[PDB]
């Protein structure tokens, strides 16, 4: 359980559907979510922020999400010189997911037999 990240579908669409299960389950209160219906009628987030300086990396968010959207990536070397850099927004989380998707998918191909 490492850096939280946002996953997409292979066509390119975000997995997160703003069911807010992750925010509800998070005992750290480190997740702030705002969402509305997209212009196409899709139910998508408008604000997706997780405070890494506040996130406890418990992975309960990864347990609660039923669409495998939020995942703690295998990245653990992400220390920053300033505290502000750790205030993760939707855009940086999506960047991290696009970066680390292949490794996370490979791990899920193993973890699926247990999860």
């Amino acid at each position: 359980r490492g850096e939280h990240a946002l996953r997409r579908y292979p066509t390119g669409e975000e997995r997160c559907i703003a069911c807010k299960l992750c925010e509800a389950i998070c005992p750290a209160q480190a997740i702030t979510i705002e969402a509305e219906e997209r212009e196409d009628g899709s139910r998508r987030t408008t604000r997706y922020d997780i405070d890494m300086t506040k996130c406890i990396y418990c992975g309960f968010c990864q347990e609660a999400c039923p669409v495998d959207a939020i995942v703690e990536g295998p990245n653990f070397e992400f220390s920053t010189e300033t505290r502000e850099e750790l205030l993760y927004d939707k855009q940086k989380l999506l960047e991290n997911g696009d970066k680390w998707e292949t490794e996370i998918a490979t791990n899920l191909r193993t973890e699926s037999l247990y999860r």
Binding site: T32, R47, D49, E84, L87
Partner: protein, 164 residues
């Protein structure tokens, strides 16, 4: 025969609340608030004593005044205080000490419990009697047979019969 939710630990909480000597304790106005040790300005604000009404979204009635003796259902709240947003993230910023302590913890079986709690603490309080639900139905559709009685269009007139 006595049966009022008689299969739970609540009976053990019914008693030990009526213990002699322990049931005769009393304190004066603002006296308990002195023992609190909190800043004195806490008592300057106003508080609302009430029971929240049933939500329109659901037919549930457990968290309502109906099961009053079953669960503490009287809440004490404070006037909301100035709130704004974080310039860097946009999260809601506030400085209220009494922001959530009531809506999360303060629960009371009867209104008089909260009245005593406020009096011994010195919190100035407002009482708002919740509206009573009505169980008596309307004259129309009073019983299931009223959906199909003669009140819909009156007695059938036997004028279209053959030979009239």
């Amino acid at each position: 025969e006595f049966a009022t939710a008689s299969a739970d630990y609540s009976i053990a909480m019914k008693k030990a609340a009526e213990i002699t000597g322990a049931a005769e304790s009393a304190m004066g106005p603002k006296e308990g608030g002195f023992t609190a040790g909190v800043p004195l300005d806490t008592f300057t604000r106003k508080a609302r004593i009430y029971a929240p009404a049933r939500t329109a979204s659901q037919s549930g009635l457990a968290r309502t005044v109906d099961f009053a003796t079953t669960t503490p259902a009287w809440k004490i709240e404070f006037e909301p205080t100035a709130k704004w947003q974080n310039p860097l993230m946009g999260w809601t910023s506030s400085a209220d000490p009494l922001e959530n302590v009531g809506r999360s913890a303060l629960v009371f079986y009867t209104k008089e419990e909260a009245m005593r709690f406020c009096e011994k603490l010195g919190w100035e309080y407002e009482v708002t009697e919740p509206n009573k639900r009505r169980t008596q139905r309307t004259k129309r559709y009073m019983q299931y047979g009223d959906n199909f009685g003669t009140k819909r269009a009156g007695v059938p007139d036997l004028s279209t019969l053959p030979s009239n």
